[PDB]
């Protein structure tokens, strides 16, 4: 038998199965093959189109094809044109989502197949889904690279640009998930999904630098991509990759993101452990289940409640439906990995479960269910009984996605084509070819990092240049660099805002956002003129920490490390450094000399650097082209001077020279009169700005902080810090110690956060806002470079941190009065923060250690699992400080490693007012857990009162000191906080005594 | 936990019996009775057995 018979058999199978139900009016396949359903999904039709394209490519190898490739290629083109038309039908939603990403403004995903219109409201679907758009982009660039023509005019290029801009911001907004259910509770909440972000990263990488028109194209067929978004997506993947979601330990939806459709996980060993884990935890006799504890269309499920009631998931386990389609995906992965053993085993497993039509055509049903007779028998013996096939397994109903995957897998298994043909864009590469790829790996090899970064020295003033030359430091003032131009960072953002504008539809282009250091490290050509920019760290900043040489040195070192470790483009990066004559400011001129000498030496903390003139570096280097533009103490107190008349305050402002008094008078004037009042030095706002700039020049930290509180300004980096804290797994609370506090659990827009923090600031204090700004930026930087230092942290509270800081500083002061925190330099606050954040050692009073540990809300490693195993062996429950933790709801709702229990236990633990009391309580809990796990014979007879136990230990140690040191009964238990846990007579022994006494009774 | 010196078994029996007498006086309002026949009567295991008093004596001796 020649190839003709097999190809004709595949053609008849496709005609009788896939293309039979195609809608000619739109080219979109429906979700149901019977009943005249008007609902259509995006994934199934796209997969069918991909399978048809694969079959056409397979049949292309015959010159006497009789035009059979023709109908398949044109069907793919018609489907893609229809889906593109349906996407472009909705235009207002895209613009709304580009500015304010919300479920209300999300792009609709389901619409009528007869006329391409919406049939169902967004209150019953959600409609928010990004994986479909990313997969559509990946496939469209796939077939464009193949040789197919889908785009005609320049308008679709602009639409693709807008779609890329919209999908760039997917790493923050939570999604409803591939299964539409999101959280396993199915209550109406959205959680982050690793598969969606992985697909987005793959599409963003693939779309970069590609000609959309195919064979012909000069200057209007390219796509521009920002590297910062790709870097952030990769970071989010690497952080969230081990666990698909916070509420889901493992799901079966991870395979397509880590298989042929994506090929996104280039880590081999972590890939192997993920594959082993998913196979071990999700293997079934009839295939792969979606994930654990899943009551999807099962026997007990009823069509009367969209949202599942709590504790129903516990009853829903053990009767999970079965999907054999994933055997085909594992078959695909095995065949691309060249492992015929997996191919044969999975084919043998698939052979009996497959069904036949009247003519014997293969059938792959959707899901498998157990009859009502084996509802309880199946629970005792997993898989003992036999399930039953679904409705779409006999006749009249099909699952077109299933037969599409089956036919593509059979086509690959029969060796009728090659993996290269189906992947012209080489998404998957072997280990021996991973040497000189773009956006993925460096030329030095995967397990190597020896990049050399180019740095250019440019002066600012001729006097500074000659002064540096007198000491041997060589630098060039900008006036001899006439052919080259140096521009700030706002030129590039305005230029990027210029592009992507269309008049017919209404288009705002790229949003005005700051550009990262990687983007500015490149060289630009505008109107034929070379443009080079320096990182945003050198430009003038109204803030105050930019006046400290140590902070700038640390920041530039961090930037150099970041450039070294996240650079993969062809060619050495370009770095520009500028030195101002105001930086020297007398005696401060030594550290900059040392840094320049070290830079000249060649190595900066293990990083190789090169220095030379700008003209040689710019010559012989690739310059990227932007051609779109051508086509297109105080003596004044608040209380005493509050009631003074306006003229008296104005005269006092006139005749006073103290900065603090001037600032407080300006504050009183703005609070009483308003910002629009006119003073002797212009408007109130102008005078405030002038005095703030003068204070910044004079480096009065209290004055600059108070002026900053006046200026109503904020840093443009809080959102990355909050989102990286959220994706790490920690929680952030903004507020003041001893006052109201706001808890953040999901990413929020900067406007809401700024509003809430500034209303709180107006309520309680004056100069705090800049203080929490400094603490949060420092904490984010430390967690970025030293992540293990914050180990054991769950809820971070800036107010408690700064209170502990002030307490430690007061202890250090001793006899001398405690130095005010508002007057501390940035270097001093950084050093003190690093000191207090240290793991701490002995020598100091153990009470202070307890206080600082409790203020940070420190928890021991493995505390949560110990609490869980305690409650499992606690028939009654645990009651601490008036809060109750009933065992039944938490056992029937929760499981071992899920985060909701950790949140609940932290909530019930956080009611303790005294932090060292909380630490004593957690130590007691750990001791109880250890002693109970060491001996299973002894069990609790009733609920335990931890307050009673700590009071008993209090009395016992009071008696012991009375016997030993002849100390009378003293109120308060502070001497215990002084007493170390371990030693001759520690707290742990007394905790063990109390536990032994409780168990004996 | 390790012993610091030689243990006196007779002493330990004496603390166990004294604690048993204190518990009996607290519970059943029984005065101090000579001889250990009451302690001999009590089973080693139960709600309050001899093993519990022996463990109390052991922990008291180890702690000191």
Swiss-Prot record, chain A:
Its main location: membrane. The keyword Membrane applies. Although the final Cys may be farnesylated, the terminal tripeptide is probably not removed, and the C-terminus is not methylated. It is a lipid-anchor. InterPro entries: 6-hairpin_glycosidase_sf (IPR008928), GH15-like (IPR011613), KPBA/B_C (IPR045583), PHK_A/B_su (IPR008734). By phosphorylation of various serine residues. Hexadecamer of 4 heterotetramers, each composed of alpha, beta, gamma, and delta subunits. Alpha (PHKA1 or PHKA2) and beta (PHKB) are regulatory subunits, gamma (PHKG1 or PHKG2) is the catalytic subunit, and delta is calmodulin. This is Phosphorylase b kinase regulatory subunit beta. It comes from Homo sapiens. The gene is PHKB.
């Amino acid at each position: 038998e020649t190839l003709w018979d097999k190809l004709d058999h595949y053609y008849r199978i496709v005609k009788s199965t896939l293309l039979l139900y195609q809608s000619p009016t739109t080219g979109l396949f429906p979700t149901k093959t019977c009943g005249g359903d008007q609902k259509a999904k995006i994934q199934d039709s796209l997969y069918c189109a991909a399978g048809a394209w694969a079959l056409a490519l397979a049949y292309r190898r015959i010159d006497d094809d009789k035009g059979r490739t023709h109908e398949l290629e044109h069907s793919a083109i018609k489907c893609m044109r229809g889906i593109l038309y349906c996407y472009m039908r909705q235009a207002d939603k895209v613009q709304q989502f580009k500015q304010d990403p919300r479920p209300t403004t999300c792009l609709h995903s389901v619409f009528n197949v007869h006329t391409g219109d919406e049939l169902l409201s967004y209150e019953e679907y959600g409609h928010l889904q990004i994986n479909a758009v990313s997969l559509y982009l990946l496939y469209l660039v796939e077939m464009i690279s193949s040789g197919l023509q889908i785009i005609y005019n320049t308008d679709e290029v602009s639409f693709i640009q807008n779609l890329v801009f919209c999908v760039e911001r997917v790493y923050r907004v939570p999604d409803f998930g591939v299964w539409e259910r999101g959280s396993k509770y199915n209550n109406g909440s959205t959680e982050l999904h690793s598969s969606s972000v992985g697909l987005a990263k793959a599409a963003l990488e693939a779309i970069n630098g590609f000609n959309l028109f195919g064979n012909q194209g000069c200057s209007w067929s390219v796509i521009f991509v920002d590297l910062d978004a790709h870097n952030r997506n990769r970071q989010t993947l690497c952080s969230l990759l081990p666990r698909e979601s916070r509420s889901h330990n493992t799901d079966a939806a991870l395979l397509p993101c880590i298989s042929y459709p994506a090929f996104a996980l280039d880590d081999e060993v972590l890939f192997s452990q993920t594959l082993d884990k998913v196979v071990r935890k999700l293997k079934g006799k009839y295939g792969f289940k979606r994930f654990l504890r899943d009551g999807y269309r099962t026997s007990l499920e009823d069509p009367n409640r969209c949202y599942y009631k709590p504790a129903e998931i516990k009853l829903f386990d053990g009767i999970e439906c079965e999907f054999p389609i994933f055997f085909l995906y594992m078959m695909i992965d095995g065949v691309f990995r060249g492992n015929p053993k997996q191919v044969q085993e999975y084919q043998d497993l698939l052979t009996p479960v497959l069904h036949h039509t009247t003519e014997g055509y293969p059938v792959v049903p959707k899901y498998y269910y157990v009859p009502a007779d084996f509802v309880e028998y199946e629970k005792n013996n997993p898989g003992s009984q036999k399930r039953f096939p679904s409705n779409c397994g006999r006749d009249g109903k099909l699952f077109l996605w299933g037969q599409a995957l089956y036919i593509i897998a059979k086509l690959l298994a029969d060796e009728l084509i090659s993996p290269k043909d189906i992947d012209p864009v080489q998404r998957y590469v072997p280990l021996k070819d991973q040497r000189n790829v773009s956006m993925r790996f460096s030329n030095q090899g995967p397990l190597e990092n020896d990049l050399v970064v180019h740095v250019a020295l440019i002066a600012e003033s001729q006097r500074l240049q000659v002064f540096l030359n007198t000491y041997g430091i060589q630098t060039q003032t900008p006036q001899q660099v006439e052919p080259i131009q140096i521009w700030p960072q706002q030129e590039l953002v305005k230029a990027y805002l210029q592009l992507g504008i269309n008049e017919k539809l209404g288009l705002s282009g790229r949003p005005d956002r700051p550009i990262g250091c990687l983007g500015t490290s490149k060289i630009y050509r505008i109107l034929g003129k070379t443009v080079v920019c320096y990182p945003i760290i050198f430009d003038l900043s109204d803030f105050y920490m930019s006046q400290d040489v140590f902070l700038l040195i640390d920041d530039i070192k961090n930037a150099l490390q970041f450039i070294k470790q996240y650079w993969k483009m062809h060619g050495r990066p370009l770095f520009l450094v500028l030195i101002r004559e105001d930086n020297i400011r007398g005696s401060r001129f030594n550290p900059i000399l040392d840094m320049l000498a070290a830079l000249k030496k060649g190595i900066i903390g293990g990083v190789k650097v090169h220095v030379d003139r700008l003209q040689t570096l710019i010559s012989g280097a690739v310059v990227e082209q932007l051609d779109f533009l051508r086509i297109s103490q105080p003596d004044v107190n608040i209380s005493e001077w509050k009631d003074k008349p306006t003229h008296e305050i104005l005269q006092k402002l006139n005749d006073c020279s103290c900065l603090a008094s001037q600032a407080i008078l300006l504050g009183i004037l703005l609070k009483r009169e308003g910002p629009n009042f006119i003073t002797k030095e212009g408007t109130v706002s102008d005078h405030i700005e002038r005095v703030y700039r003068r204070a910044g020049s004079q480096k009065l930290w209290l004055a600059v902080r108070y002026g900053a509180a006046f200026t109503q300004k904020f840093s443009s980096s809080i959102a990355p810090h909050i989102t990286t804290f959220l994706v790490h797994g920690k929680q952030v609370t903004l507020g003041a110690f001893g006052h109201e506090e706001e808890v953040i659990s999901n990413p929020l827009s900067p406007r809401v956060i700024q509003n809430i923090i500034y209303y709180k600031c107006n309520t309680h204090d004056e100069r705090e806002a800049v203080i929490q700004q400094e603490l949060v930026i420092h904490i984010g930087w430390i967690i970025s470079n030293n992540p293990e230092l914050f180990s054991g942290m769950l809820k971070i509270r800036i107010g408690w941190i700064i209170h502990a800081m002030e307490y430690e500083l007061q202890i250090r002061g001793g006899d001398k009065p405690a130095l005010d925190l508002y007057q501390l330099s940035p270097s001093e606050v950084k050093q003190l923060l690093l000191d207090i954040l240290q793991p701490q050692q002995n020598g100091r009073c153990w009470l202070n250690r307890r206080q600082i540990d409790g203020s940070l809300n420190r928890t021991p490693t493995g505390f949560y699992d110990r609490v869980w195993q305690i409650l499992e062996r606690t028939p009654n429950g645990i009651i601490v400080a008036g809060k109750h933790l009933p065992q039944q709801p938490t056992l029937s709702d929760m499981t071992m490693y899920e985060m909701n229990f950790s949140l609940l236990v932290e909530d019930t633990l956080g009611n303790i007012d005294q932090p060292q009391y909380r630490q004593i309580v957690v130590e007691l809990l750990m001791v109880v857990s250890i002693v109970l796990e060491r001996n299973p014979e002894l069990e609790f007879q009733d609920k335990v009162d931890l307050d009673r136990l700590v009071k008993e230990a209090f009395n016992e140690f009071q008696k012991d000191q009375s016997r030993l040191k002849e100390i009378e009964k003293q109120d308060d238990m502070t001497s215990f906080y002084n007493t170390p846990p371990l030693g001759k007579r520690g707290t742990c022994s007394y905790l063990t005594k109390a536990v032994m006494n409780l168990l004996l009774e």
